[PDB]
Amino acid sequence: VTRTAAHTHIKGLGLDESGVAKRVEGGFVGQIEAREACGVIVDLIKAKKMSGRAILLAGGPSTGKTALALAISQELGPKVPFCPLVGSELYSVEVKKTETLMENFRRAIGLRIKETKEVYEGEVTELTPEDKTISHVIVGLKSAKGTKTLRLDPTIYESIQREKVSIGDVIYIEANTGAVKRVGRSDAYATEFDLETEEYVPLPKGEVHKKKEIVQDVTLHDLDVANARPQGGQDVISMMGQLLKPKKTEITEKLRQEVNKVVAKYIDQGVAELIPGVLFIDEVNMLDIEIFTYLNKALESNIAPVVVLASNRGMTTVRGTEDVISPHGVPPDLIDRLLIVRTLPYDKDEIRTIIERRATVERLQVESSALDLLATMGTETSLRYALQLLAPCGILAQTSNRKEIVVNDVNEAKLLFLDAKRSTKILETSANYL
């Protein structure tokens, strides 16, 4: 019914209008500074003015950095574009990591447009040249409420020849795009043959010419791929244009200058509205020194929005460097333009509320003795081992036909499943590399 995978219990940060964060609100217990400061970051994205700001989230495991990342991604809403990304994913062999990094900086930003398109539909009456010719075809579309004849290009006529239409077939033709879809044979010719593979559709109601306006949103990187390589078409020249060089290449700066030039012309006409977004990079310590040094100049660039990082290390060696020792795996020049939000750990009662609220979201019933036992396992092995063992206790409750988690079920979970320190303690004694 409802799939829960270490998430979906958080519906945002849950802050007040004054700013003060509650103790128990929105799937969060404790962590006041990262939630309230994270809401300051939420308003900072809602400013639509700031750019180049980089805020890393540094902390230990089971502390709530990625959960805070889903808290800001849920607090922003669907209208603000969110780009999840891992630093291990930026390595590519088709192009460099620079093109994927700056390309992702063009993936964070969004831009909503509004445009009107013309819709034509009707039953095909005549396909004939004009009177003399170079071979164009007047297509007489018979609609219900009107009958009109229209002259078309040879390419859309070629797609009309592709759709195998004839006299008396309902088609769908778009003016600005040129795409052709056939609905089927009209209902007037259903009695011509007793059995036919072509389905019989009724006549389309309404006029021949129709107009509507869409508030469709499309990312600026999608306009960059639309400016980079040919995608598809229904003709041979467009499909071979796709088939010839479909391998993605690096993009020059002048192309982005013309893209945001005509985009700036669209925002000068009042049509579109520029809204920034979020590029969230997971495991920043796995990045190379080249991506760090291009992040130095990339954060000095203009269009780079509020980028949130997540690094789970300290004074370690940077990847790509031999003797450089720096905090968080980040070079000190990039760490100078970074902002650190320290994550706070959780007590025994806060582990009890994590297991409690995770149990209520997981729709399992836990008794108080098993809740205190899972609290002691939360303060003995790990948090992820108790949250990992919430489900097998309910499974053993289902096999034992019980509706609540008991002491013998979680002790049977202790016997059937082992944690880290029992695994290391068992693997310490070896006959032949146990």
């Binding site: 300051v40 970074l338 902002l339």
Partner: protein, 430 residues
């Protein structure tokens, strides 16, 4: 209407120097660094002179000094019609393109060529259109009347005039402007239009094109598709040699004049030694633009070798280059820079918030205060007043932590964070 939101490098507009090249204290967004702005003005009049070439310069210094902001001031004071190429040091590393040929591509991208010619234009109001064709044969015969304030005549049209006149919809009320050499029609206005002047006028058109564009165009036909799609690389040098002799012949004939542009390379410390020796040869070529470099690292080991060379660059590069250095700023100049960032960001600040923000800008860094000025207006904005208070700066200080403070927090919590060997205490007890 160059696209301009609030950048770190948006307030700097021009170098801001006098006629005697002595820099003012507060001029055109740049405050301080008198010797760096004066020497950068010597580079500015070096590009504006254009009689010399093949020179490399370097701008060095500690962080929070603005060497990239100084080169931004040079590029902003350079003005239009002069090409400026700003590339990264790690941008030359590519898989489809070699690093040396990409560096040669940047060296061809830096210098442009101005070529001018004259064309004729007939602009005037249409009175009526009377074409003549045949129902079976063809061979269209067009006639229309063109009118202005002091001329009104009937123009007979050819085949291509009715081809462009019927492929583009036009009326009697609609007004056209026809070029004779191009053959395309400009349907400008209908009866915007309100025209004056003579009917047929001749004006000059000037086009600016860099040498790299001529290199990939004269490489092959699909080098234009590689000019847009970016799938170029590794051009044969016969195009470069014959294009150099053709450009020199265009300079000798007086047909094409060239503009010496500036090549700016950011983060030049992590560059390969092959590109270093390639710059060591390419600085002595005839068509060699002025190169400005910004070495950002310190003394370390160069990539490609084992020894720790000083400056991060070999001495063959630094022998043929001039070096400008920058120094740290005073306490008053940080308050002045935060004041002009308050003027750029349109943020009204108080005196005590500027004093405490100046103190925490001296203590921590320039960039942290340059972002605390941004968030302080929004902690103030949540209180529904435009005035920034000291409580917003203190809250923005306790919320957004410095790097050294969380370095102390990391060193206090090393059991929480994962170590170099992958060991991490994810539990609390035992």
């Amino acid at each position: 209407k160059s696209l301009s939101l609030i950048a770190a490098h948006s307030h700097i507009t021009g170098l801001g120097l006098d006629e005697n090249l002595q820099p003012r204290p507060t001029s055109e967004g740049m405050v301080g660094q008198l010797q760096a702005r004066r020497a950068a003005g010597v580079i500015l009049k070096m590009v504006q002179n254009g009689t010399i070439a093949g020179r490399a310069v370097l701008v060095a210094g500690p962080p929070s000094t603005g060497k990239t902001a100084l080169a931004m001031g040079v590029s902003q004071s350079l003005g239009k019609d002069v090409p400026f190429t700003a590339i990264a040091g790690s941008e030359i590393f590519s898989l489809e393109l070699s690093k040396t040929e990409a560096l040669t591509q940047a060296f061809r991208k830096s210098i442009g060529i101005k070529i001018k010619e004259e064309t004729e234009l007939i602009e005037g109001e249409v009175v009526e259109i009377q074409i003549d064709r045949s129902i079976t044969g063809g061979h269209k015969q067009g006639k229309l009347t063109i009118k202005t304030t002091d001329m009104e005549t009937i123009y007979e049209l050819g085949n291509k005039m009715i081809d462009g006149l019927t492929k583009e919809k036009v009326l009697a009320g609609d007004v056209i402007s026809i070029d004779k050499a191009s053959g395309k029609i400009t349907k400008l206005g209908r009866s915007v239009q309100c025209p004056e002047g003579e009917l047929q006028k001749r004006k000059t058109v000037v086009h600016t094109v860099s040498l790299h564009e001529i290199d990939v165009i004269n490489s092959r036909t699909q080098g234009f598709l590689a000019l847009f799609t970016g799938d170029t690389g590794e051009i044969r040098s016969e195009v470069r040699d014959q294009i150099n002799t053709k450009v020199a012949e265009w300079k000798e004939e007086g047909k094409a004049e060239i503009v010496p542009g500036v090549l700016f390379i950011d983060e030049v410390h992590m560059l390969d030694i092959e590109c270093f020796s390639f710059i060591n040869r390419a600085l002595e070529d005839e068509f060699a633009p002025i190169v400005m470099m910004a070495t950002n690292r310190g003394v370390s080991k160069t990539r490609g070798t084992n020894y720790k060379s000083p400056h991060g660059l070999p001495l063959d590069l630094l022998d043929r280059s001039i070096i400008i250095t920058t120094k740290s700023y005073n306490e008053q100049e940080i308050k002045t820079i935060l004041s002009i960032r308050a003027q750029e960001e349109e943020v009204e600040l108080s005196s005590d918030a500027l004093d405490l923000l100046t103190k925490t800008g001296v203590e921590t860094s320039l960039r942290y205060s340059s972002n605390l000025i941004s968030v302080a207006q929004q902690i103030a904005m949540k209180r529904k007043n435009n005035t920034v208070e000291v409580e917003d700066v203190k809250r923005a200080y306790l919320l957004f932590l410095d790097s050294a403070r969380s370095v102390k927090y990391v060193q206090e919590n090393e059991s929480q964070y994962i170590d170099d060997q992958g060991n991490v205490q994810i539990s609390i007890a035992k």
